[PDB]
Design a protein around this ligand. Structure first.
Ligand SMILES: CCCCCCCCCCCCCCCCCCCC(=O)O[C@H](COC(=O)CCCCCCCCCCCCCC)COP(=O)(O)OCCN
Ligand SMILES: CCCCCCCCCCCCCCCCCCCC(=O)O[C@H](COC(=O)CCCCCCCCCCCCCC)COP(=O)(O)OCCN
Ligand SMILES: CC(=O)O[C@H]1C[C@@]2(C)[C@@H](C[C@@H](O)[C@H]3[C@@]4(C)CC[C@@H](O)[C@@H](C)[C@@H]4CC[C@@]32C)/C1=C(\CCC=C(C)C)C(=O)O
Ligand SMILES: CCCCCCCCCCCCO[C@@H]1O[C@H](CO)[C@@H](O[C@H]2O[C@H](CO)[C@@H](O)[C@H](O)[C@H]2O)[C@H](O)[C@H]1O
Ligand SMILES: CCCCCCCCCCCCO[C@@H]1O[C@H](CO)[C@@H](O[C@H]2O[C@H](CO)[C@@H](O)[C@H](O)[C@H]2O)[C@H](O)[C@H]1O
Ligand SMILES: CCCCCCCCCCCCO[C@@H]1O[C@H](CO)[C@@H](O[C@H]2O[C@H](CO)[C@@H](O)[C@H](O)[C@H]2O)[C@H](O)[C@H]1O
Ligand SMILES: CCCCCCCCCCCCO[C@@H]1O[C@H](CO)[C@@H](O[C@H]2O[C@H](CO)[C@@H](O)[C@H](O)[C@H]2O)[C@H](O)[C@H]1O
Ligand SMILES: CCCCCCCCCCCCO[C@@H]1O[C@H](CO)[C@@H](O[C@H]2O[C@H](CO)[C@@H](O)[C@H](O)[C@H]2O)[C@H](O)[C@H]1O
Ligand SMILES: CCCCCCCCCC(=O)OC[C@H](CO)OC(=O)CCCCCCCCC
Ligand SMILES: CCCCCCCCCC[N+](C)(C)[O-]
Ligand SMILES: CCCCCCCCCC[N+](C)(C)[O-]
Ligand SMILES: CCCCCCCCCCCC
Ligand SMILES: CCCCCCCCCC
Ligand SMILES: CCCCCCCC
Ligand SMILES: CCCCCCCC
Ligand SMILES: [Cl-]
Lengths: 1034, 156, 144, 96, 48, 48, 48, 48
């Protein structure tokens, strides 16, 4: 096949051109994102029961929906929360490879049929079924600087004027408003209502009658009276449009003549739909837009288009309104790409310099400079064919493959340059012989490296999806490189290289290059003499090898493992968690201290704090909040002391002073989509209808037992909330019937006033919005206020709640969890330092089997994923080694010689582990894929050494030591050339301190370290392996 | 209010005997209370932790402390069927006829959840069987409406 | 035919018919299923210690086993050989007539006094300034 | 039922349309709201689009909007299905 | 009485049902016991 | 093209004064001029 | 119609280059392709 | 598939005849089917 294209260099150029255009086309229309889809498809059902407690929501909504989630395909598990903010969230997580669109419609279809079984109030609110694919391109903040607008005023402006135009912008898939559009708020007064003998029931009846759409008909409609001249539509009553119109709603006409209007018993204003959350941006009222990419879109183009649309919205903003960008992935992705393109261009420049240093003619330096781009472009076409995106994982996948690509180019050209020097043949004949010596090996190497990388793609769940990004990228780049090494580079070598007269090793030349040739020729003789001495005393080097294999095994266990390294992403967040029962105002006071600290003490670093009162991740409530700290640019924050690492630790230390508030800062995880992913995720389950309290006691028993093994388990705590005092009020049925008060009037009056009530819709400036009636704050704060609410009896007398009610304090759950339809309590925790998460899980299972009768357990999330990913691991490791062995056995026609190659593996791994341990890094995915590319290139070097040695023994009838010494002599230059270029190539990644350096460090250090040992050790140890193996067998 | 007061409220609720023991040594306020007005004795009586009820009383806890709606620890203990705690509270001078803001006695609550042993103990310490709540209802009225024959015998 | 799409298309049309159906038929739950007519297997459940009746076992299976089997991937349809428990109010017309009552009064009372009420919160948002109390209000709950 | 084009457009057409963002292979979206109370929103997709997946993605997006619609619009039902503009034939029926 | 969903794998779904039943057995009341009075899958295993 | 519309304005204060519910007004106007779907019947075996 | 006319230039461009590269690969030449591809206008003018 | 030699026949009411008339028509078809034992066997209704 190389012989075919040496005679046909134009054909070779055409294939290179077709690969180049196919790849060029792919680079134009490939999707660009930070990370691809990794988490398995999950669908989230969401609903609101206004003014509902956790139990009411669970027992009327959550259980009814859960009971109806049948006949849906590929469901792994189902979990739900029901909380005191009137909210339920049911998350159905599906098998990896499930069509998310099919999964969503099947869930939504089963919900549709369940809707008639839910309460009126929930049906009216609606139940949202959406794909739980939370990955924001950016968060656009909208604020008011001149104090003219509330957060509700800003949210409504963004809803009406901004949101829809962003939704319509190119590449924008989903848009989420951070706040509500206006609602017509009727703030009722119980004193005014009682004075005119009215109730919330009367207010709701009046609003429904006088804010509605009445159907009329037509003038001269069919069937008509023949001779009818005119056909016209009749417009009757239509919805109200103003606070003034709602003010004029007639409640009753008094006997004296005067009219009672709605404005006489209630304050009427446009407000928010709910007041649970107070968003502030550096102390100022705020709203915003959470924006996500459409599938197959470009991050850079979309982000530019969003800014272009916001730009032409600027002129129409009311005074004081400003756009801000507290979160934007585009700057990070912009650098991630550029820093990879720089590595790929620098790597090609370094090859040029190294190629010139040794071979010392410009015609040779061009051949890799052509061939490497052709393979990289080709790789993009194969990414596009497999439906992959240009992302952080696929990009660093190519950087890790650049060592393998560069080697294929160097190996082929070097071997032609040598054959020309030693035998004096012209370029075309020399290339033909040279390719004859390596073509079988290169095809053998392609199969071995496929066996190393392809099995990595067949890991399941989230971790397997991440490994599949590197696998397809490296296998594709490596495969094309071999096709290019057999088609194009032979052709280029035969048509571009100058002849070399027999014996001309450049020793006769003058200056630096003359000195270098004579220097390198000495060093080659020093090397071959040195191996000669090593091959006399092989027994010693087997003992030194077993020390390397033991040294490896120790570091492999001692080095702590992670998934992906934390990054200075330009943002982080601070959790504010006040004690249970604490009010919105108390939480605001803590967030204000937090916001004050960041703009005072970190005024050089911090650009903005986005304080969100009422939203914690552990659960919604007045007693919780989060501040999202946005930093200034990476350039303006010099040194490690002004990074997210340092600011986090100072902030946590500073905020530990604050009393009656657990407050701490922490960096975002690399993949926000994937979550945190460290330790385990446990579900304790009520399997025998024990109830909340008996499940609580069982949980506390398990937590207390977990605390007695700090050697194994650390930070074992519940993810859920604790029971809180709640105001139990008992309506006396007998007394209500006696006074002639209906229960429906009592419960509506209580609910509407204290909880709020969504009555119906109205139209504000040609936009449909909700009407809420609720008590003005003054009259729904304390138990004493209950007595101030009056209900009209049948006989017309007004009765206070005190007459027919009793109340007491008791404890109940503000957040009831469920797992697979049964009541549950999620427990988080991680393995203690030194122990594996596998051991931690095994203990939690043992502790759990000694809990009360009817208490079961299950593993969820990362623990579900890890427990079934661990099962695959051994079988994939096995298949890899078995196929590598079988490929080498077919290459060499020997069951034993394979071992001479396969023994190289620890030589690469030791230096990687020394570099990682020395620099204080982790056994992460970048390190692990780095090991494979180190093992691959050292294995590739070893294969050509053994191939050359065996062929000298087989063809030229040479002795074992003669052939081995001659082989390593011929292979010294190309190995050192690749190693010099590739180690200098990954040097900037190692030292890098800037944006995305955590990933670059994880890639570079495990490769540089691995390559220094893999080179220095293999040039001495490979000949030992070959000789010792060849002696032991046959 | 105080620092150790909050920790005693949490520890009394959770039933951590050894932590309460230390807090009693370090002079933690036994008359610390929630927003709702629950002392550690309320919380220990509610969640049924007997040891802590005894310990708090030895450390001069108010046995007849009332919450914002007028409920005593005896109300909670008698309502939630903690016979041992009911007996202990009564021996340390708990008002057996204590009324909450609704006029609901510990007898009324004990009768409602149908705790036979606790009703007898309350009666032994001189519980007013004829005591009425705001709706004129006795413990007997609760027993006949609940249809508890065994309870209805004792309250005649 | 893709049975996933066949189910989606059939139910899109059923959803136009749904609101025209009687309220009683909606509240029993209409079901759309894509299954074989023939049984893969019958999972029987007995009590070897004769401690539970036919009715007791059927309720256990309905309330503790069925829903998880129904959610399992590949299970198109699950027939309970028996019934889940309901609260059975067995009316006596002699005693109803005695107190001038009908089944309409019985149904109205069960709706009034077996209710799960959303009653809001003490110190709910938006609150007054200087509010220290925030607690859920629990009114009537389902009977048990 | 009984609503004019302007009322129908504000309460139904815009509510649905503003939830039809980010559907795969969407070329364009025409719609009309008329005096009889009827809304029709036609989403046309790129050539080679799986019309069944298109339908499913549109149905999922609509059911987010469904509860924001008037309850009379909900009680009538909202059909999401593949469409065609042109009559294949007209079958006429007469009495002789 | 369990019926296969359209096109579903008979033995794989039967295996999944047995797995889910196995999770319930530990928490049964005293006396309760699963029996298999009708199953078409054991014929498929033995005949293959 | 834009069509002429016959806008009827119901005076609810004047209606309540004369003792007529606006539900009876809306249904009368709607039923009479627009028509009103009441329920189904059976026409020779078929629901209409 | 707009789309059909916008994309035609690209279609002719890539069609000519593919025919060129296919001739170059087949006849191991740059001169035989360039010699052939110059004929295209002789045909195109007849069509127009 | 079927039952080797079996057939599944549907008698349709095409003109709103009603249940009684369709029942009579069914009985007429069942009577005539019984008078050909040479050709048809076990011809019975699947309904009640
Ligand atoms: C499912 C995926 C499928 C993907 C498929 C990829 C696309 C394939 C396209 C089909 C190509 C098939 C070509 C078959 C014909 C070649 C055999 C006939 C050879 C022959 O008689 O012609 C001589 C060339 O022969 C020779 O000397 C040998 C040279 C053979 C030339 C073949 C040209 C193919 C060009 C296609 C474009 C490249 C595509 C990328 C692979 C002319 O000789 P002469 O004397 O006139 O000339 C100077 C010669 N030295
Ligand atoms: C929709 C918009 C898309 C637009 C994209 C456009 C993409 C570009 C299209 C392809 C471009 C083709 C380029 C061909 C260049 C040929 C140079 C002419 C050389 C020449 O005439 O000499 C030949 C000899 O070549 C030899 O002896 C062979 C030596 C090897 C050739 C070296 C040059 C190849 C360089 C190609 C790089 C192109 C990169 C572009 C991406 C004579 O031939 P003869 O037949 O007379 O000799 C037979 C004698 N007996
Ligand atoms: C010269 C240099 O520095 O590289 C430039 C040059 C660059 C590699 C460009 C990205 C990309 O178009 C490249 C392709 C494959 C685009 C498709 C074809 O037309 C190729 C013939 C072209 C050659 C190089 C080029 C034009 C660069 C980038 C990346 C641009 C993006 C960001 C976010 C900075 C870069 O500058 O980093
Ligand atoms: C030859 C050297 C080896 C090749 C190495 C390639 C390096 C890696 C390239 C990463 C991708 C670059 O990013 C890619 O190009 C530019 C970025 O501005 C964008 O290009 C976009 O805008 C330009 C504007 O003229 C349009 O012509 C193009 O159709 C459109 O896709 C792409 O949306 C993006 O996907
Ligand atoms: C030997 C050299 C290697 C030659 C390999 C040649 C294969 C080139 C692809 C052939 C055409 C089919 O491959 C086609 O590629 C285009 C982009 O180019 C992809 O285009 C699409 O990719 C993804 C996934 O679908 C979408 O999210 C995105 O919107 C779009 O760009 C198509 O999904 C794919 O079907
Ligand atoms: C030391 C820190 C660096 C560690 C990384 C390098 C590890 C690999 C070692 C390579 C260098 C070995 O260096 C080489 O050793 C062999 C023996 O071992 C010497 O060989 C000499 O001693 C041996 C003793 O058994 C004799 O058999 C032999 O005849 C004699 O020439 C070579 O003269 C020396 O050049
Ligand atoms: C020339 C290049 C060739 C590259 C070859 C690439 C082939 C890799 C794909 C095949 C392996 C994937 O298929 C893998 O099969 C094994 C069993 O066989 C499964 O493993 C399962 O069965 C084994 C039985 O040995 C159990 O011990 C294990 O607990 C269980 O998980 C994995 O769940 C699955 O991931
Ligand atoms: C013998 C082996 C050789 C195999 C070679 C195969 C080559 C195949 C080339 C496919 C090129 C991809 O096809 C691509 O289609 C789209 C149409 O959607 C075109 O798109 C074009 O039309 C639209 C009209 O709306 C314009 O807005 C757009 O700017 C324009 O580029 C691209 O110009 C074209 O590049
Ligand atoms: C030349 C022979 C090389 C065989 C070793 C490679 C085996 C790879 C199997 C595989 O697919 O695993 C992927 C895995 C990601 O989870 O990659 C890794 O985690 C790297 C594993 C370290 C190298 C193994 C050898 C250890 C020292 C003896
Ligand atoms: C499917 C396994 C293939 C292993 C690689 C085969 C390489 C063959 C080259 C050796 N040779 C045929 C020249 O002798
Ligand atoms: C180049 C090899 C491509 C393999 C792609 C992955 C195969 C599907 C496996 C998916 N999964 C692990 C979830 O089963
Ligand atoms: C699955 C691994 C197969 C390995 C085959 C090795 C066989 C060696 C036998 C040679 C005897 C001389
Ligand atoms: C895998 C076992 C290796 C066997 C080697 C056989 C050597 C050839 C026999 C002399
Ligand atoms: C010996 C003939 C080799 C032909 C290879 C063709 C590759 C496209
Ligand atoms: C004494 C060891 C000499 C080894 C020199 C080889 C350098 C490549
Ligand atoms: Cl030169």
């Amino acid at each position: 096949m190389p012989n075919f294209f040496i005679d046909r260099p134009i054909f070779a150029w055409v294939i290179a051109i077709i690969i180049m255009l196919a790849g060029g086309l792919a680079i134009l229309k490939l999707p660009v994102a930070q990370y691809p889809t990794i988490a398995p498809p999950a669908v989230t059902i969401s609903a609101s029961y206004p003014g509902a407690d956790a139990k009411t929501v669970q027992d009327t909504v959550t259980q009814v929906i859960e009971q109806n989630m049948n006949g849906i395909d590929n469901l792994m598990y189902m979990s739900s929360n029901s909380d005191s903010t009137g909210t339920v969230q049911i998350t159905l997580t599906f098998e990896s490879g499930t069509d998310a669109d099919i999964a969503q419609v099947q869930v939504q279809n089963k919900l549709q049929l369940a809707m008639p079984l839910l309460p009126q109030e929930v049906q009216q609110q609606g139940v949202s079924v959406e794909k739980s694919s939370s990955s924001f391109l950016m968060v656009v903040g909208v604020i008011n600087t001149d104090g003219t607008m509330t957060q509700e005023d800003i949210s409504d402006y963004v809803a009406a004027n901004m949101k829809d135009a962003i939704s319509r912008t190119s590449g924008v898939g989903d848009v989420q408003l951070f706040g509500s559009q206006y609602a017509m708020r009727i703030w009722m007064n119980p004193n005014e209502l009682n004075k005119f003998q009215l109730t919330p029931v009367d207010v709701i009846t009046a609003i429904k009658a006088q804010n509605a759409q009445v159907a009329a008909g037509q003038l001269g409609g069919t069937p008509p009276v023949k001779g009818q001249q005119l056909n016209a539509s009749i417009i009757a009553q239509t919805r109200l449009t103003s606070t003034e119109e709602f003010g004029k709603i007639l409640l009753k006409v008094n006997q004296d003549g005067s009219r009672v209007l709605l404005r006489d018993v209630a304050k009427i204003e446009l407000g928010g739909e709910n007041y649970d959350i107070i968003a502030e941006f550096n102390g100022q009222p705020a709203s915003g837009l959470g924006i996500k990419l459409a599938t197959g879109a470009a991050a850079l183009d979309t982000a530019a288009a969003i800014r272009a649309e916001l730009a032409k919205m600027e002129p129409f903003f009311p005074s004081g309104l400003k756009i801000v960008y507290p979160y934007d992935t585009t700057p990070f992705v912009k650098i991630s790409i550029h820093e990879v393109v720089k590595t790929l261009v620098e790597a090609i420049i370094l090859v040029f310099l190294v190629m010139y240093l040794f071979l010392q003619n410009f015609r040779a330096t061009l051949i890799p400079t052509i061939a490497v781009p052709v393979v990289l472009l080709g790789t993009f076409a194969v990414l596009a064919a497999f439906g992959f995106s240009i992302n952080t994982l696929t990009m660093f996948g190519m950087v890790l493959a650049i060592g393998l690509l560069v080697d294929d180019a160097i190996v082929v050209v070097e071997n032609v340059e040598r054959v020309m020097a030693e035998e004096g043949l012209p370029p075309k004949e020399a290339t033909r012989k040279s390719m004859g010596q390596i073509q079988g090996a290169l095809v053998g190497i392609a199969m071995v490296l496929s066996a190393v990388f392809v099995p990595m793609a067949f890991f399941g769940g989230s971790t397997g999806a991440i490994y599949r990004q590197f696998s397809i990228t490296i296998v594709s780049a490596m495969a094309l490189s071999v096709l290019v090494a057999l088609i194009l580079t032979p052709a280029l070598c035969a048509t571009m290289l100058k002849p070399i007269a027999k014996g001309d090793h450049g020793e006769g030349k003058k200056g630096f290059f003359g000195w270098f040739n004579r220097m390198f020729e000495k060093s080659t003789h020093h090397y071959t003499d040195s191996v000669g001495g090593i091959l006399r005393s092989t027994g010693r080097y087997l003992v030194l090898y077993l020390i390397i294999v033991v040294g490896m095994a120790y570091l492999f266990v001692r080095l702590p493992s992670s998934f992906l390294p934390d990054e200075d992403q330009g943002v982080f967040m601070t959790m504010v968690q006040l004690p249970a029962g604490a009010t919105q105002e108390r939480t605001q006071k803590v967030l204000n201290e937090v916001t004050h600290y960041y703009l005072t003490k970190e005024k050089n670093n911090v650009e903005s704090v986005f304080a969100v009162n009422g939203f914690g991740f552990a659960g919604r409530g007045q007693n919780t909040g989060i501040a999202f700290v946005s930093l200034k640019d990476w350039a303006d924050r010099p040194g490690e002391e002004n990074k997210v690492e340092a600011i986090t630790m100072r902030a946590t230390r500073a905020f530990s002073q604050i009393k009656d508030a657990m407050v701490f800062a922490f960096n975002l995880p690399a993949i926000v989509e994937l979550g945190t992913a460290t330790g385990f995720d446990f579900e304790l389950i009520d399997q025998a209808g024990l109830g909340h309290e008996k499940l609580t006691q069982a949980r506390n028993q398990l937590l207390a037992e977990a605390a007695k093994h700090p050697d194994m388990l650390t930070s074992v705590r519940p993810n859920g909330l604790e029971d809180t005092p709640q105001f139990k009020i008992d309506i006396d049925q007998e007394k209500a019937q006696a006074l002639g008060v209906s229960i429906n009037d009592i419960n509506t009056t209580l609910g509407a006033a204290w909880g709020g009530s969504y009555v119906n819709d109205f139209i504000d400036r040609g936009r449909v919005k909700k009407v809420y009636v609720m008590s003005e704050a003054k009259y729904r704060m304390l138990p004493d206020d209950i007595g101030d609410w009056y209900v009209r009896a049948a006989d017309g007398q007004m009765v206070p709640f005190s007459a027919f009610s009793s109340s007491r304090w008791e404890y109940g759950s503000p957040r009831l969890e469920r797992y697979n339809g049964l009541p549950s309590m999620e427990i988080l925790g991680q393995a203690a330092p030194g122990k594996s998460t596998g051991e931690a899980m095994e203990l939690m299972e043992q502790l759990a089997s000694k809990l009360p009768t009817g208490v079961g357990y299950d593993w969820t999330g990362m623990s579900y994923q890890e427990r079934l990913s661990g099962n695959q691991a051994p079988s994939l490791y096995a298949i890899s080694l078995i196929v590598v062995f079988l490929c080498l056995a077919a290459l060499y026609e020997s069951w034993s010689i394979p071992f001479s190659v396969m023994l190289v593996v620890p030589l690469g791994v030791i230096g990687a582990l020394l570099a990682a341990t020395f620099r204080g890094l982790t056994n992460d995915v970048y390190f692990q894929v780095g090991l494979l590319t180190t093992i691959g290139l050292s294995a590739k070097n070893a294969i050509l050494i053994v191939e050359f040695a065996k062929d000298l023994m087989d063809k030229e009838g040479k002795g074992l030591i003669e052939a081995t010494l001659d082989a390593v002599r011929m292979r010294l230059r190309p190995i050192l050339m690749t190693s010099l270029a590739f180690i200098l190539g990954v040097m900037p990644l190692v030292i890098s301190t800037g944006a995305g350096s955590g990933a670059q460090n994880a890639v570079g250090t495990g490769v540089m370290g691995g390559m220094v040992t893999a080179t220095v050790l293999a040039i001495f140890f490979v000949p030992v392996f070959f000789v010792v193996v060849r002696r032991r067998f046959s | 209010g105080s620092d150790l007061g909050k920790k005693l409220l949490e520890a009394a609720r959770a039933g951590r005997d050894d932590e309460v023991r230390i807090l009693m040594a370090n002079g933690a306020d036994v008359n610390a209370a929630d927003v709702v007005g629950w002392t550690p004795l309320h919380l220990a009586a509610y969640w049924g932790h007997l040891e802590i009820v005894e310990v708090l009383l030895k450390n001069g806890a108010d046995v007849n402390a009332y919450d914002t709606l007028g409920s005593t620890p005896l109300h909670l203990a008698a309502h939630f069927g903690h016979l041992e705690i009911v007996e202990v509270l009564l021996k340390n001078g708990a008002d057996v006829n204590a009324k909450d803001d609704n006029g609901i006695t510990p007898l009324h609550l004990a009768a409602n959840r149908g705790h036979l042993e606790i009703v007898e103990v309350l009666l032994k310490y001189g519980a007013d069987v004829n005591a009425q709540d705001k709706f004129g209802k006795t413990a007997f009225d609760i027993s006949i409406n609940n249809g508890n024959e065994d309870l209805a015998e004792i309250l005649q």
